[PDB]
Design a protein around this motif. Sequence first.
Motif, PDB file in Angstrom:
ATOM      1  N   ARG A 161       0.827  -1.202   0.000  1.00  0.00           N
ATOM      2  CA  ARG A 161       0.000   0.000   0.000  1.00  0.00           C
ATOM      3  C   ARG A 161       0.862   1.253   0.000  1.00  0.00           C
ATOM      4  N   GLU A 178      -0.286   2.508  -3.365  1.00  0.00           N
ATOM      5  CA  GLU A 178      -1.525   3.246  -3.139  1.00  0.00           C
ATOM      6  C   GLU A 178      -1.251   4.695  -2.749  1.00  0.00           C
ATOM      7  N   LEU A 190      -2.646   8.329  -4.072  1.00  0.00           N
ATOM      8  CA  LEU A 190      -3.680   8.922  -3.229  1.00  0.00           C
ATOM      9  C   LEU A 190      -3.511  10.432  -3.126  1.00  0.00           C
ATOM     10  N   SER A 209      -7.700  -3.216  -5.626  1.00  0.00           N
ATOM     11  CA  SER A 209      -7.851  -2.061  -4.748  1.00  0.00           C
ATOM     12  C   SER A 209      -7.615  -0.761  -5.503  1.00  0.00           C
ATOM     13  N   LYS A 230     -10.151   2.129  -6.041  1.00  0.00           N
ATOM     14  CA  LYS A 230      -9.783   3.398  -5.419  1.00  0.00           C
ATOM     15  C   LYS A 230     -10.080   4.579  -6.334  1.00  0.00           C
TER      16      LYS A 230
END
Lengths: 464, 110, 17
Positions: free
Chosen positions: A152, A156, A160, A196, A200
């Motif tokens: 992550r 991610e 983000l 994911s 997302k």
Amino acid sequence: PPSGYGVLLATHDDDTVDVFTSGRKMRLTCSPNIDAASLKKGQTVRLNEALTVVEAGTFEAVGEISTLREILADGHRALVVGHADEERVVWLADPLIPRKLRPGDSLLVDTKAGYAFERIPKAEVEDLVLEEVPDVSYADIGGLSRQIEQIRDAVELPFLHKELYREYSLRPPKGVLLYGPPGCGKTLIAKAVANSLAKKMAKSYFLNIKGPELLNKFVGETERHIRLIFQRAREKASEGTPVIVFFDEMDSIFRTRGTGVSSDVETTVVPQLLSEIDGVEGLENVIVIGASNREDMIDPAILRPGRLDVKIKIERPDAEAAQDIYSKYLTEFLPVHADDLAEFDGDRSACIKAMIEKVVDRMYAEIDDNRFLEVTYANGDKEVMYFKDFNSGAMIQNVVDRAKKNAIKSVLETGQPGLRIQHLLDSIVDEFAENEDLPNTTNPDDWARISGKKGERIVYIRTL
Amino acid sequence: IVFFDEMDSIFTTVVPQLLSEIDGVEGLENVIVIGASNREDMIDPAILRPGRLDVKIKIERPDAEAAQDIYSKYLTEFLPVHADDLAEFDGDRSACIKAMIEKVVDRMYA
Amino acid sequence: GSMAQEQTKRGGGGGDD
Ligand SMILES: Nc1ncnc2c1ncn2[C@@H]1O[C@H](COP(=O)(O)OP(=O)(O)OP(=O)(O)O)[C@@H](O)[C@H]1O
Ligand SMILES: [Mg+2]
């Protein structure tokens, strides 16, 4: 009333236009009703008997289709190849000048007029590079919480709050390398992070390519396949959406460029991939994820920092991780024995949790009932390696499947709709009755690594 | 039904590709994969691991009766029969065929 | 365990106008 059609070619400062009609180019004047400024190249124009343009519609939707070869530097012409390898330098219409056209694109053209109207999507090129929708989630993976946190952080988070990264001038990671013992869940993590990221965004695209599928009998085909894969990735990422490219079983292909295999073509396949990652042309929103149970066999040039810089080591699940995996693969809805249900007074969750605890306690034990292998090292010390050092997730899946098969046999023999804890307990010892590929030859590389961890070289392996 | 014949000739190699294809086709439960091999020892146990190819069936030959059954399947009642041999069974073609099959099977397994 | 290079063989083809 009758009116013909023609193909517009260009505009002039004298408020005059060029129209291709009946296989001939003519100089015409636009009618006062229409505005000459709004005209665009390649647009169909309605003519009349007086040879005056009175209305311009859309572009023609029928004609020949040709393969694009290159775009000329002038920016208004393109070299394409016809069906019989005939080469034509045709004009480009306004819509052609998503992403800019690449070589290999199919264009709708008419040779007599000599214009390229529309880019025609091809199903074959889309089918060549597969883009599936992953469905595995982080919930399906248990016992690897810290690895999930790391992946992550490396994937991610950069997307983000990418504005924060630009404020800090931080470059998002370009490569993640998962390695560890076989069957520990390397592909599951990649599928979960892909899913994911897909959820997302509120759009992304995922490319999965296997190892042996990038091998061809001839020479020069694997390199062009890799080039096409990366060209597709760049095309998808040019819109700004992140693109994930996953290489599966990197141990087989592009091994060490040195000696490696005594007879292999690897020496000409790894550099190309290198040139696709680090080079004068640098990809922007492409993340390369590789998974290999043999990290030492991968090319050190690939493992250099900057390419596959992020490195995650998956390890064999312990007792708590085994309990987590069992909980993942044993749900409340699963049928249970009536005796256990009566003992737990209908508390099905407590029943299944207790059964899982009993199973994982049975699996992890130093009793001589779960003996797996006998290992003799260089010093000559004999050690009994039990199941505790080889509890892979796929092994847990096989245990659960065998226990469920035993439950099916029991319910078809007796008729009571339930699952017994004794079924799983017997499946634990029946798992190793059939080979699970854990045992190997005299000196395996995995056992050499285990010996390096131990400090004494493993010399003797005996089945027990 | 996808059938593979003479799989003992074969099995870092083609085995992982076959395993991957089998896992991919596992979603299609209607398709049935049937493999044949006369040497179970030479077959790599990896394909014999639990999961995909769990069911293994051992076959043999001809228990003599099967050979008779096989002869009945081949040498049916519609084949011509000698009159002299019919004289030994009063013209009963089925009984004559059965006795001839029994005789030839007994002599072959003698 | 060796690679190959291909030589093409053109096939007859003709059209009118
Ligand atoms: N938390 C977990 N840890 C390990 N394995 C798991 C976990 N959850 C499920 N599994 C099982 O592990 C199996 C293998 O998963 P995955 O495909 O990610 O690894 P793999 O690529 O098969 O490993 P290998 O490299 O040995 O082939 C899956 O069939 C899955 O059912
Ligand atoms: Mg995998």
